[PDB]
Every structure is written in C-alpha cells, then in structure tokens.
Design a binder for this molecule. Sequence first.
Ligand SMILES: COc1nc(C(=O)NCC(=O)O)c(O)c2ccc(Oc3c(C)cc(C(=O)c4ccccc4)cc3C)cc12
Lengths: 11, 229
Amino acid sequence: ENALLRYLLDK
Amino acid sequence: KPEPTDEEWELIKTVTEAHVATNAQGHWKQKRKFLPDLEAFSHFTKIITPAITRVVDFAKKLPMFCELPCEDQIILLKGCCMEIMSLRAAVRYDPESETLTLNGEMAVTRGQLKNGGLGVVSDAIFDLGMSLSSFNLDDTEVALLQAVLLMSSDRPGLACVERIEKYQDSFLLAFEHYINYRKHHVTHFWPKLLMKVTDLRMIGACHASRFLHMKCPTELFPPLFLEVF
Ligand SMILES: COc1nc(C(=O)NCC(=O)O)c(O)c2ccc(Oc3c(C)cc(C(=O)c4ccccc4)cc3C)cc12
C-alpha cells in the first residue's frame, strides 16, 4: 500500500 | 502594504530554491519537441512517472514537509501532485503555438491532452495557462502556490492537521507580502491568485474522479500514477 511512494519519501 | 519579513525572505529563498531544483529544464522552450484512445494514453501515462517524482522532490526539500510523519507526507503528496503538475504545465503555456510543455520537453495541444485521457481537465489546465499569462508569475510566486497546495489541512486521513495548517499560513503571508512587494500591475492581484489556487484545487479533484472511472486494467497504468490517483 503506497510502497514506491513510501520508498521515495524515505530516501 | 506589508512586504516580506527577514524570516519570510528565508522561507522564500528555501521554497523558491526547492522549486527551481525540481522543475524540468528551466531552456524548456528551446529543448521543446512538438507531438504529431489507449495509444495516445500509453505515451502520456508513460511520461507521468518523472513528473510525479519531481513533485516528491520539491516536497522533500521543504524542511516543514520533512517534519511531518510519512503517513501525512503520502497523504499530502497524493492530494497535490496533479495540482502542482497542472500549475507547472499552465505556467508553460505558449500563446502563439497554443501549447503547454510537459517535462520541459514535450509541447502538447489542447486536443492531444483531451485525447490522452485528461478529458475536460485539459480544457481547465489550458484555460488556466491562458489566464496566468497576464499574471506574469515568477519562480518565487509559482513555488509559493505549490507550497500552499502541498500544505492542505483539508486532505482526508491526516494526523497533524493543525501543524500543516500553521505551515500553510506561513506560506500564505510570505506569498501575500511578496505579492505586495512585487507590485504587479493587476488590480486585486491577491484575491485573483487566491481564486487560481481554487481553480487548481478543482483540477486535482476532477482528475482524481476520472481515475475511479477507468477500472481498463490497472497494470496498463504506471505504478506511481496509481499510488497518487
Ligand atoms: C497537467 O498534467 C501533467 N503535467 C505534466 C507536467 O507539466 N509536469 C510538470 C513539469 O513541467 O515539471 C506532465 O508531465 C504530465 C504527464 C502526463 C500526464 O498524464 C495524464 C494524467 C496524469 C492523468 C490523465 C487523466 O485524466 C486520467 C485518466 C485515466 C485515469 C485517471 C486519470 C491523463 C493524462 C494524459 C499529465 C501531466
């Protein structure tokens, strides 16, 4: 759930 | 009329620098290439992923954004991508070719975007760009509009609602105080810019309603595009 968007949010 | 305070100038340096660092090209007009219904719609959805990423990059360069929990960051970014990407294209309207520029490289016509799935929203983005000509928005004004849309407390599921609303109120003063200082030769420039924020907010909601419409297998759509809607 929003895992790429989360990966990019954290560096 | 009140002009930017010393701390408001720092906030303007910061948010302006964020914007310029994450804005495609900036030449965008001379690296521009003109383009000559799930087949125009591939070759657009394909070009979104870098544009969404540039928005994430803007938000991550804003120290106020980075103080929020990532649940709230995800929520904020999900609500302001299409707004920011729409503003970023509308400020790149060429009155003579009657095109918008995406990724600072591809010139598109009103028809091309409506044909690529934007539907009525492409009419809204072009109309905005046309009206943003007489406004003569600079990089600081665009960056501050972007920060105002990002720090929307109204977005559903947020935790730090009042912290976000405080960040947004900091940008709105700095932006108004900058507006007072830039002395634009338009009457009631602030009231009219505030109406434009609302035009953009309407673009972000209509686009996010045409998504729920196309469900056309989801895997034909880029991964980032699906996480933002
Ligand atoms: C203004 O929008 C955009 N702005 C910029 C841009 O200027 N970037 C900023 C900068 O210059 O730095 C872009 O690069 C864009 C690239 C692709 C794009 O593609 C879309 C999108 C996103 C949504 C729809 C739908 O309506 C829809 C259809 C089905 C389901 C849901 C939604 C259709 C298309 C073609 C829209 C872009």
